[PDB]
Amino acid sequence: EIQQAIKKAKDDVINVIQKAHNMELEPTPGNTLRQTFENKVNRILNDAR
């Protein structure tokens, strides 16, 4: 279960990278696109851990 959850989180962050590369990631107000992307990646990985 732990390995499947880690693999699902890695697939989620790959999908986040793909949607950011495909110009589909709307930046949140108060921060830029890099900050929004890094916040989403860090939130996904910390939630996985």
Cβ at position 41, least distance to other proteins in Å: 7
Rounded to the nearest whole angstrom, what is the least distance from the CB of residue 23 to other proteins in the complex? 7
**13 touches 22 (CB < 8 A):** no
CA distances from 38 to 30, 35, 49 (A): 14, 5, 16
Instruction: Check binding of 8 to other proteins (CB under 8 A).
Output: no
Interface contacts to other proteins, rule CB under 8 A: 6, 9-10, 13-14, 17, 20-21, 23, 25, 32-34, 37, 41, 45
